[model samples]
Target: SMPPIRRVNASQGSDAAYQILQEDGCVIVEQVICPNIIAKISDDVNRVMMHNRTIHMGDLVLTSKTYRDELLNLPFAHEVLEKVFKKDSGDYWLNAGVILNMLPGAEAQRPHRDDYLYPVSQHMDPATSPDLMINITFPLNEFRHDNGGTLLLPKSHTGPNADFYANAEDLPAAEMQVGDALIFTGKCVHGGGANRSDKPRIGLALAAQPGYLTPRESNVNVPRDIVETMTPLAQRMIGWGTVRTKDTYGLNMLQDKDFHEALGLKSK
Candidate 1:
């Protein structure tokens, strides 16, 4: 039998979400945000997607003020991320940001794990190694099977052969609402489902990883001028002030004076 998609109320906190995530490698937290916030993000990003840059496979990078404030700083997300990642690394940062808008006729994406690029993760048993990354998808619009929500294989994060059953008949679609968040570890096998409906399916994808790892989109590459305009937390989320160290002890943000100030601490 196929495993079930674990879910919890956002108010229940990260403890509940973490427990489910460790077991199934995926879970959805319901009603994490409000509809008004989602509308603002969709509106602000839609214009950016059409003009400033291109959208590929319905993925568009998000840099607007609305998305930066509303989506990135959700208490539900921050709590869960702090619990899930801080245990391994003292701090974590955003790996990538994209709006997944699956339009009519869009085909399903191939099933794969996002952590495949890291050399050490290759063929490593998930039980022994730590989770280096996690992905959170917040729907801007309702997600349904016909509208290409998402297809995920539960418990696939446990072993090297997780993808061996990618084509299994029991795969489940992540049906979620605008305020709900679909959270999954980097090891989970998943992909976007095909859009069979007339309208589009829209969601924001925020990927997070340990500060030690190289992010999919390098924050340093973003112009410093733009970085300056973002909030302090937003700056950190985009990989600013990541302390470099060889030991596995912990992060020391005080190394960079700017980071110290950004984190609301006085330099000693």
Candidate 2:
């Protein structure tokens, strides 16, 4: 029965959003902040796909160009990082891609936290340096309720509301529209919503994180032929120069042949 959030304001960053996040931990910013840029990116990626600069594996579409290269690097995304992470870290390795939900009657995704995707050492400790995941969703098309926009357990990032899986009814829907990128805390309980409609719901999911951990996107042992065809940004995301410090796990997997090779590192 919840209505969709539309008409995001010119004064976008309000304490109201913060209050909702503080009180509910989620707020919807609606409208096309940059429709022209969105269209440009869509065109660029489509071209990449036609030219083999893109790959269609199962449902996801991976573009060779890194997240922000086409848009002159959207710095605002990094701004969110600085606020949420409080790490004062530099922004790099930003990855973005288009996700299409076309198959109808898909089930609602199981509730989970992004932290679970990381290794055991970092998962349990909240203070661990270089937190693993930070993501933002930009909708290219309207994500209506029937279309299965992402479902978020509101306020699941802080205090008692943080426990989404524990109390599913407490979580809220993250239904939004084009140009509204939903920036969130990865620790929150969330998952893709069910696509109950006939039309496909398309979105651009751009993710970032500290350099220590590798993203699931990094497909190791890629065919040398495909690797050669990738852009520099793609090269980095798929493991190029991504190095975790020696202090990690009190070991230096960096020098190991398997780890080094995965990062596209070669010795002279």
Candidate 3:
């Protein structure tokens, strides 16, 4: 039997994270339990992180066909994205991290919203609008104050808090534990945690954003041989085949594909 999915209580903490995000932006869910399927997906990421050279700035973290495939199969992560953004989402890239190793000695990142690089709102009209990107952060390893937990300025998403660091006087750090996932708007001012301990801090970052988003490392760069090895679901999610666009055209493409067809793309 399928167990009931666990959800975050919106009223917890500063209700401001959710309340302000509507007209402003951002929300914080203390512990969003990732499904059992996500555990296996995490294992896969561990495998690659353990084996791969140059783990950062490489697709093995952001574009591995297998990694992306496993992530989309997890209903727990996927469903919340649908609920928060209230818009249909497509399969998206999975960015696993080994950030601790990036700069052996570096300062904690300054506060800033992601919208500088990734926009978070789309206006249908003066009265109607939609979210452009919803971010889901999963802690595979326990994140503690000493372990470099990400610092967040709660409710900074509401207005011009984008330059929160400029003042450097008001900011708060968000601490989470393993198996906990934090969902927030793309416009929120957040930054990577600092790793002071002697172990590599790794986790998964999943995002669903506007289709027009030019991926920082787009799936289009996937090699021909690797592309053929993707599962049909992966293909559709990564755009190798088709995904239902918010408009009728994407639906047309979905119908034309013959029900999750890989359309001759390779898969292993």
- How much is 81 displaced in model 1, in angstroms? 1.1
- On residues 13-67, what C-alpha lDDT tens digit does candidate 2 reach at each position? 5444444433443456554257666666566555643011112222122343333
What is the lDDT of every predicted structure here? 0.73, 0.50, 0.49
Name the regions of candidate 3 deviating beyond 4 angstroms.
1-58, 61-66, 84-104, 118-129, 165-170, 221-233, 251-262, 265-268
lDDT of 3 by residue, 1-268 (tens): 2111123443353333344445434444554444454466556665654122112433542534335555554455555444544354443333322223322233456666655654344322212434456666666676654545555655445454333442222334445665566666666567655556665555566666544454454566767667666666555445555444445245314445643452455565
Q: Ranking by lDDT, best first?
A: 1, 2, 3
Lowest summed lDDT window (length 10), candidate 2: 50-59
Summarize candidate 1's per-residue lDDT along 193-239 as a digit string, tens digits: 87788987778888888878777776556666555665656667776
Order of the predicted models by TM-score, top scorer first: 1, 3, 2
- The reply for model 2, stretches above 4 Å from the true place, is 1-27, 44-68, 86-102, 121-131, 159-171, 219-268
For each candidate, what TM-score against the reference? 0.84, 0.63, 0.64
Between candidates 1 and 2, name the one with more favorable TM-score: 1
